Structure formats: C-alpha cells, structure tokens
C-alpha cells in the first residue's frame, strides 16, 4: 500500500541549435500522468492518464505556467553550471531534477526528496531530514551556500509535507481503479538447449503491477546471483510490466534449480520447480 508521486525534469543544451530542450513527466507510483515537451507544438502541460483529464482548466493553466517556470530555471542553471565548471559552449550538457513525496498504506507522509544531477552525476540532494543538503563536489557546495542563505529547504519541506501529500491522495482516489490495484505476476519457466550438453533456464514474470519485483535462481538452495542474467524490468505497454532471469545449466541438472518470485501481489513468495 505505499505510494509515491514523482516529477522528473530533463534539460539538454544544444549549442547554436536553439534553446535547451526541456522534457518533464509526472508519475504516481509506476503510472505516468502528465508530460511537457518544449519542442512540442501545444506548449501546454498535457494529460497522460485517463484520471487526470477530469481536472479543470485552472489546473491545466496553472501546471502549464509552473512547468514553463521550471523550464526557465533549468535554462539559467545550464548557464550557471557552465560557469562553475569552466566549460565552453562547444558541448551539449544535461541537467536533471527529480522531486516528490511518499506516503504509507495509511496515506500519511513518509519521506520527501528533491535532487539534481549534472551530466549524469549527483550534484545536490535534499537529505531525509529535509533540513540539510548533500553536495557532491565543490561546485555543488556553492549552490549549497546560496540555498542555505535563501532558506530553500524550508520552502521545499512545506511543499513536500503539504501540497505534495494532499494531491497524491487526490490522484490516488480519482484514479483508484488504475492506481490502487495490484496485479500479481503470472510466472513460468522456459527451457531451451544451447548445445548437446547445456540448456538455458529462463524464469518469467508477466502482467504484474506495480513494477517492484525480485526474481532469483537457487541451485540446491544456494543463490546463483553471480551466474544469473537479469534484464531490466520492462513495460508491456498496457500499464503492466515484465521481467525475466536466466541461467545456463548442465543438461541433466534442471531438477537442482528453482526460481523464487517476490511481489506484493502474491500472498506468499513463489517457488517454481522442474519437477
């Protein structure tokens, strides 16, 4: 029953080919519900989930205004970081920001976060007390000093503990058919020879939501984690997710291997066997 709301922002500079490209998406748990693309024609925040379309024009006008505002800060931020790092305009660079809040099964506030990355590396992050910052390098310390003098964490903590929690609950209620479901994985194993003496064992989980899942292989009860191929959890395209784990084993030894599946939709963890 735990839930998150998260906003993700990406701005990428493109020297002498216009203003930076800004893309923004919003999620409730593993379900996208809004997008903004600075290259798209609408120049509006757009719905991406059925249950958010019911919001009135005040909502859409205001979220468009605010997301364009985020677009403008990240545009200044790209210039700021160029200065902090003595970088020219020969290069495209990337700023990323993520913030949001978590509630428990009781829908009361759990924790909040607000993070930045520059060119793929941690830059600065709000710590879990929502009072202090983690600055990754000397440039981010400069930001930290400015944000402490400007009392940035106070203002974020008020948003994260208030507005963020209240609208997460609203969205959870309005989209409860979509959001408050749990779809347990449908699981099976496949077997295919790779030679006259070896076979691929692959453990599948399909049609599950939310995306959180654990698949492990054991051999005679011993975890084979170092020997397992694990693909990244992937979307089916319909709001559910897929995952598999494979080992290559000696033909004859299939009965030693078991797959173990953990997901919140299963009353108990599953063990799949070759007998």
């Amino acid at each position: 029953g735990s839930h998150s709301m998260r906003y993700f922002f990406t701005s990428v500079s493109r020297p002498g080919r216009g203003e930076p490209r800004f893309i923004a998406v919003g999620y409730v748990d593993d379900t996208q519900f809004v997008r903004f693309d600075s290259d798209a024609a609408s120049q509006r925040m757009e719905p991406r989930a059925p249950w958010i379309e019911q919001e009135g024009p005040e909502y859409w006008d205001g979220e468009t205004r605010k997301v364009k505002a985020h677009s403008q800060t990240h545009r200044v931020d790209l210039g700021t970081l160029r200065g902090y790092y003595n970088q020219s305009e020969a290069g495209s660079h990337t700023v990323q920001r993520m913030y949001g809040c978590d509630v428990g099964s009781d829908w009361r506030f759990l924790r909040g976060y607000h993070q930045y990355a520059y060119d793929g590396k941690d830059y600065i992050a709000l710590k879990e007390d929502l009072r202090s910052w983690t600055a990754a390098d000397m440039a981010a310390q400069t930001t930290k000093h400015k944000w402490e003098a400007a009392h940035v964490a106070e203002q974020l903590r008020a948003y994260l503990e208030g507005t963020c929690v209240e609208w997460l609950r609203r969205y959870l209620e309005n989209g409860k058919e979509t959001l408050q479901r749990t779809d347990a994985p449908k699981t099976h194993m496949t077997h295919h020879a790779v030679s006259d003496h070896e076979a691929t064992l692959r453990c599948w989980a399909l049609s599950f939501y939310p995306a959180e899942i654990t698949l492990t292989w054991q051999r005679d009860g011993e975890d084979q984690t170092q020997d397992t191929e694990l693909v990244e959890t992937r979307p089916a395209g319909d709001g559910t997710f897929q995952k598999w784990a494979a080992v290559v084993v000696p033909s004859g030894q299939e009965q030693r291997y078991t797959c173990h599946v953990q997901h919140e939709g299963l009353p108990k963890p599953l063990t799949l066997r070759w007998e």
Binding site: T73, V76, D77, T80, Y99, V152, L156, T163
Partner: peptide, 9 residues
C-alpha cells in the same frame, strides 16, 4: 501538483 517555488543552482 507542481511546486511554484523558483529554485536556481
């Protein structure tokens, strides 16, 4: 909902 606060690095 989005935050109205302006945040600059």
């Amino acid at each position: 909902k989005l935050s109205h606060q302006l945040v600059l690095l």
